[PDB]
Design a protein around this ligand. Structure first.
Ligand code: HEM
Ligand code: HEM
Ligand code: HEM
Lengths: 727, 309, 727, 83
């Protein structure tokens, strides 16, 4: 053979490259020198290919991999074809059950390091020294949809981190919003069945916009806080890099003296917080159902590593009852104004997996996987989680040895008396499989709890009460946090929330369900309630207009850390700009353009009405990455149109649509020279409009303007003007 | 309890209604008078719900389905809470492996009847008498995507029919195009791996528009015929009702005298043939990823029964 | 804790030691220096224990492995105890389905080496050079019984060898008899269901002595050949080391020139052929259900490595139709008098596993696993087998990745485009998962067939005929092979066969089934049929008495290779003798006895009426291995009673019974000095009798006489004398 | 769950209750029972919340655990009275 092109263009370069410059590849092939302890210990199961013969799984070389064995060349296939049968059998058994929830997700390897030793508050070894590096494997996800569902759905997002520490795996299994929808794990199946596809016909996929979700929510007001977050732009993240992460539950840090400190875990995006707008997210589910998964992969291949800061909200044991909400109540957030997040470390995601199925599909995270230094609390949602993840993994990964699947193995020692189980890899030589034993001198042996390298001992919390199936009365308050969240949003964030509720409830077929939801909103905030009501053609009653608003939270009437955008934190590095080409581009605009983007780490995609290449005024040959229809404005953060021969694209319906879409979706648009004729398509005044960069040519002032707009992410002052754009 | 609205607008009318008029429902509640032999024999396993107490799977009545058992109302959950563990355990084990191919599909019950006896060419009992009616169960599907992928992708479509005949189940497992991509079964795993999401990153979902697929096609010219079909509007049917169906392979019919006749199986849409245009199909994967499943369900609920010859 | 004895006696020495001398142990601790390529490649999954901390599977050290977490020391167990839950969860899921047939088996590691290149007849790499060593893993088994059934039942034995060749795994899956019960694989479920426990009550375990088996046999005369073998002493082998092994089916050897030669595979036991007698075997199923497993393991711990010679019956393509029987009929043997077994190589089993579950229980052998140089034939039983092993392994071993379980992995390279599946360990880096591809330059690639290291290509056998479900008329002959077998047996063997059928038919409750089997025996041989009928109180009719005997097989009226004992082949090394002590043994006798046994590699077990020690006449302290009742005569090959204070045990019922049982089961007995007072117990004349060694002391020829008797295995001449005797 | 292949082991004939069993558990490997309830969750309004919880009582009542008093710290400890 030799099917590869002689020029070597089938293989991507093993160096950082921008999105779309090269074919993506397995991490170890794309960045062979990006290493960490976990990645290196996976080297025993990694399998190459180049220069090897094709074989059965028993090692027998195959001569003809194109044909079954038959009696005559037009005869019947023969039972003795063991090569065909092994190949089809393995193929026939490829699939395993997807995750019950969070089936759709994207993962990467990276590392964690603390900013300082935290031994005063925890004896956790991975937190003990700023020079201790811990390998991580992180999986981001949606909740409801199948493994084949779309990424940019409206949804809570999962954010799970497996820390491979020297004293055990610690999995921090969180989401992108600080609370959950429900209080007690006993209701998880009910909730999840309500949000998932309805059982008669299994519709709708990956959406909460259906009758059973809003029915459950209308009947269970504890859900309203997380529903608020889901209806906000938090439920449609621009990227997994630009969203927050939260453990949700209050846990415990145990120091070496044995002091317990209540803690809530936080991941702060160093790229900043950024979300899509609903019409763009929903259209993206059809043009690129893999958008987030692709963006993650290509940000890492480009060297735009996703980086997050680990943060702790720390509350002393004596302050347990100092708030006006229960700290164990998972539908309640701890406002950063009351208890600040202490920046404790940084996590960097810097290498993709080699095989999606082996590493991401088979990875198993569990909140119950803790290490000495950490402990649980009585949070009734967390308590029930401790049982489920272990149970579900027995069938999802076929047995009790899922910790022997390479991605799941600890990198530290593990020795015990557990044996057998389906697909047992470990061959134990211990003469004993029980303890106490004398035949192996009682090894492996228990270890007393201690300051370092000690055995696990639970914090000795005092437990007093009767065995009861009862919700704590302290958990019975459902509207103050939703109200606090609502008042902390900017006006346009508020409007997005209203629009999220209105669009979802418009899809509820049974009108009484929408009315019961609006009634719940009336208990939160009347302006929110009226605005949703008005979109549903509902009139609030007399009684609903007089509902007394819930109390503030510990004196707070808002908290800007709950907004995505109130406090400017945007970052342009890794964002992408679409450049609309023409057949004779002013090459001086392109150079100014590309030089400037490249200095801010912003990528570009050269678009035209056909593939191939175009030639600039000076004769520069410009390669086209995609067409206008093929890489729609939904996929980029901004649109730039350089001068040249605009008449080539001024009547291109796709070109005009590109700008109208980008305009509708509040993205920065820049028009150089004769590209200013596109102003009429998006009806921009002669004097201009904030959000639209326009100049005689593409100099440095023009690129600074555009890049300033990109750092502000979207042009929120344009909201009022997009009503009147048919797009 | 008093949860359903007093006006009864929670329950859909048990009668044929047009799309959007009533909330959709399980078939035996939506159309209780529709029957066939297969639907009747499923009766011993159907489970109701109205007026029954809530219980564990062992039949123990539950008093509080809102809470876990704990030591104090703010205490730790107890291991003895067998009601919680049974409920969460069953939830934990709800999934099964999706199909290797054609994981995304929509199905419906129906019946088949031959126009006339075919005993001169086949001794198949289900084709032996115009009065003999055979219950069927049919599943329509895409090929590449997972169970959670979108319906109106560009794809070949499966059309599988299970015939519950009096001499055995006959499954007629076809597609909506008259040929397949490949010639020998030994290459199936090669072709399917090439069409499926590439192995390093698992992109793209439900689409053939990516390098490995065209790579495979370009090296295996036998695939061009079905590729042509897939690139045409045949790849984006308007509805499972407006697409043809084919068994593709030449099979044999065997009569009572032992005479063999080569046969190729066909399904003709009595609603006629119709497809979307690409832009509309791709945008609909975004706006309504369940559009064909929904359209099939609603046509049946409306009485626009999908019909095929 | 530090529970071992300070003397270090909890630990067996890492050196060859006789059976019973030390506690047995995992192979790699008992013989660390016994290595081979496969044994070395498993080192990546072997797990130690000593000096390691006890942990969870996630690597978290455990402090208290004696207690659950509860709310108070007498309170309820908490759901948050994740250590308890992982520990119980793994335990709860330890079991996997047992093999459908051959569930009971015992296995060991070893190696194979050919005597000379066989390149002229086969291009199989493991047979091409006498210096080429192939690691093997072998499992011996019963057929019907569960994994927990007894070793010494009457039954065919499995003898499966996994050859880890440089060109792939080759599994040689045979039995201990040269034919099988049935001709076509479609009846395997019927035959197996008939021999297995009857469905209503699941009785009887591990035995063919019941109605459904004999019902099936009486309606399917194709089974008689293998039923004869099973009813003979072949069905109750003394040890897996003293039985023959056969591939049964005719396969093909393909040389580099493309020439096909027909072959039947044989294994010759270098320890010789030896079986138990029925009463002893049956009693041994109760006293020690693990006798074969134990003997195999202790033989290897003592250095008595089981050794077998691989032999080939070779038949040219031109002689396919030259026999009276069809070569492709698995119910027919190839008489060694017609086609000699050509010695090919030697297999030595020299190391036990470390963990029975991991290596033995999960080992997957498959007769379809062949390598270039071998090929199948149309034998219809073989043809269906090729489908079954692959299939059954998907459920028994949890998925299509069972080749990744350590014991099953090829030691040679394996690369292909198969992906995923449950429990996937291999992380593929190939950009391509399909071929032909250009993106990896088509790797891994197909390899043409050739003399060495080429791809597999099936032999181009001509196929011709119609698609039919039809038994070949050449297979319709059922009685001449059974007759040949019968006539080749010694007279005491024939009697044992008659006793086997008689006993088994006596457990058949429906008398007509017994009558029908008798009618079938009457088509084989009249003497056999009459003797069995007499034992059942059945009279043959005049017609049955006139059935004409089936023809000879190609002129043969007998073939001594078919007998276990017609041709002496006794080997004493590794046998074991019971020494019945008294409380003042003449140490002079003991010294003579022990030295002589040791000189021949014959083991001894010192027995007494209690455990502890006894002191010889000269003050030698003698350690007792077991009591008379605890290590019964069933477990030794011979019995020696030295002089001393015989009055100590003269009236010991167990001591007397011990001799009665050993005498009844035809074992050599030696009585020294006053030990001759035991002659009355077994009714021995004053003058003596062949099979009883007696002298004034254990000097001179006393040990040589006893060892000559051991070399002939049992005292067949004593049969008539045991008839009576109440034991 | 592994011995009997999934969570629907209560549907294997010998294991089935002879009394009524109704709840909102669904799916799982080898699911026999075909549920017609429009709802697979509670509380629900679309099936008027059936099947419903039943208060504890003298006969045919819902299960309620005996309210035993629990007092102690979280410990992995054998009671001294067991020694
Ligand atoms: C604070 C509330 C919760 C959060 C933040 C959370 C988060 C997550 C995340 C991030 C995943 C995906 C992990 C991965 O990427 O593999 C997941 C999966 C899962 N969750 Fe939770 N979850 C919560 C509540 C619950 C509850 C209450 C239960 C059941 C009592 C539960 C049961 C599961 C199960 C069974 C899975 C699938 C695990 C697997 O198959 O490996 N979750 N959850
Ligand atoms: C003439 C070409 C083919 C046609 C028309 C076809 C059609 C189909 C259809 C319609 C389904 C979905 C059945 C359902 O709705 O559940 C299906 C599934 C499947 N196909 Fe085929 N297919 C073809 C070729 C193949 C080949 C060559 C193989 C393997 C050699 C194969 C293996 C499978 C498997 C394993 C499934 C999943 C079945 C299950 O999990 O129940 N298909 N195919
Ligand atoms: C010449 C006739 C046969 C011989 C010599 C033979 C020999 C054996 C042996 C020695 C084993 C046990 C392997 C081990 O130790 O793991 C075995 C297992 C087995 N046999 Fe065969 N057998 C024969 C006929 C058949 C037939 C006709 C079938 C079905 C078509 C069959 C199906 C099986 C299966 C399913 C297993 C269990 C394997 C596993 O779970 O890995 N055998 N046989």
């Amino acid at each position: 053979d030799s099917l590869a092109p002689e020029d070597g263009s089938h293989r991507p370069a093993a160096e950082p490259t921008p999105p779309g410059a090269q074919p993506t590849a397995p991490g170890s092939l794309k960045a062979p020198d990006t290493r960490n302890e976990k990645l290196n210990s996976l080297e025993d199961v990694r399998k190459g290919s180049e220069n090897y013969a094709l074989t059965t799984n028993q090692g027998v070389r195959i001569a003809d991999d194109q044909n079954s064995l038959r009696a005559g060349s037009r005869g019947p296939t023969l039972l003795e074809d063991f090569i065909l049968r092994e190949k089809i059998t393995h193929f026939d058994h490829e699939r395993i059950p997807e995750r019950i929830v969070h089936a759709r997700g994207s993962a990467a390897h990276g590392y964690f390091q603390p900013y300082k030793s935290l031994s005063d508050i925890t004896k956790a070894d991975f937190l003990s020294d700023p020079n201790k590096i811990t390998p991580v494997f992180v999986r981001f996800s949606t909740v409801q949809g199948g493994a084949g569902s779309a990424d940019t759905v409206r949804s809570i997002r999962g954010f799970a981190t497996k820390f491979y520490t020297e004293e055990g795996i610690f999995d921090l299994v969180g989401n992108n919003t600080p609370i959950f929808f429900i209080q007690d794990a006993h209701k998880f199946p009910d909730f999840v069945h309500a949000v998932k596809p309805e059982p008669h016909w299994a519709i709708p996929q990956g959406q909460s916009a259906h009758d059973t979700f809003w029915d459950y929510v209308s009947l269970q007001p504890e859900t309203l806080h997380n529903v608020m977050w889901a209806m906000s732009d938090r439920g449609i993240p621009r990227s997994y890099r630009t969203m927050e992460g939260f453990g949700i539950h209050t846990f415990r840090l145990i120091n070496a003296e044995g002091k317990a400190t209540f803690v809530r875990f936080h991941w702060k995006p160093l790229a900043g917080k950024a979300s899509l707008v609903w019409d763009e997210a929903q259209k993206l589910t059809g043009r690129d159902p893999d958008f987030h998964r692709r963006e993650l992969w290509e940000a890492i291949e480009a060297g735009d590593f996703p980086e997050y800061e680990l943060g702790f909200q720390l509350i002393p044991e004596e302050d347990e009852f100092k708030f006006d909400f229960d700290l164990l109540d998972p539908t309640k957030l701890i406002p950063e104004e009351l208890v600040p997040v202490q920046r404790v470390g940084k996590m960097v995601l810097n290498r993709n997996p080699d095989n999606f199925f082996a590493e991401n599909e088979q990875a198993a995270f569990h909140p119950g996987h803790i290490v000495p230094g950490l402990d649980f609390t009585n949070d009734p949602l967390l308590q029930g989680r401790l049982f489920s993840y272990t149970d579900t993994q027995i069938s999802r990964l076929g047995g009790p040895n899922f910790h022997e699947i390479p991605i799941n193995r600890p990198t530290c020692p593990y020795h015990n008396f557990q044996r057998d189980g389906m697909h047992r890899m470990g061959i134990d030589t211990n003469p004993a499989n029980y303890e106490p034993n004398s035949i192996n001198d009682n090894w492996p042996r228990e270890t007393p709890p201690g300051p370092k390298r000690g055995g696990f001992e639970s914090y000795q919390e005092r437990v007093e009460g009767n065995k009861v199936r009862e919700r704590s009365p302290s958990f019975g308050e459902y509207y103050s946090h939703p109200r606090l969240f609502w008042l902390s949003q900017t006006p346009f964030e508020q409007r997005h929330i209203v629009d999220g509720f209105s669009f979802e409830l418009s899809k509820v077929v049974r009108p009484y369900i929408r009315e019961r939801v609006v009634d719940q909103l009336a208990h939160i905030d009347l302006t929110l309630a009226q605005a949703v009501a008005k979109n549903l053609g509902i009139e609030l009653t007399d009684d609903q207009l007089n509902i007394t608003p819930p109390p503030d939270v510990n004196g707070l009437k808002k908290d800007p850390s709950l907004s995505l955008y109130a406090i400017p934190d945007g970052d342009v590095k890794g964002r992408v700009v679409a450049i609309l080409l023409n057949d004779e581009v002013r090459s001086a605009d392109l150079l100014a353009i590309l030089k400037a983007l490249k200095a801010k780490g912003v990528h570009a995609k050269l678009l035209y009405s056909r593939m191939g290449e175009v030639t600039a005024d000076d004769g520069t040959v410009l390669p086209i990455a995609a067409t206008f229809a093929g890489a729609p404005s939904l996929t980029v953060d901004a649109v730039i149109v350089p001068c040249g021969n605009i008449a080539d694209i001024a009547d291109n319906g796709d070109a005009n649509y590109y700008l109208m879409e980008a305009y509708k979706h509040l993205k920065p648009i820049a028009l150089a020279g004769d590209a200013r004729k596109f102003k009429a398509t998006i009806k921009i005044a002669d004097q201009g409009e904030e959000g639209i960069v326009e100049a005689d040519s593409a100099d440095g002032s023009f690129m600074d303007e555009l890049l300033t707009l990109m750092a502000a992410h979207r042009v929120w002052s344009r909201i009022p003007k997009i009503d009147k754009i048919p797009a």
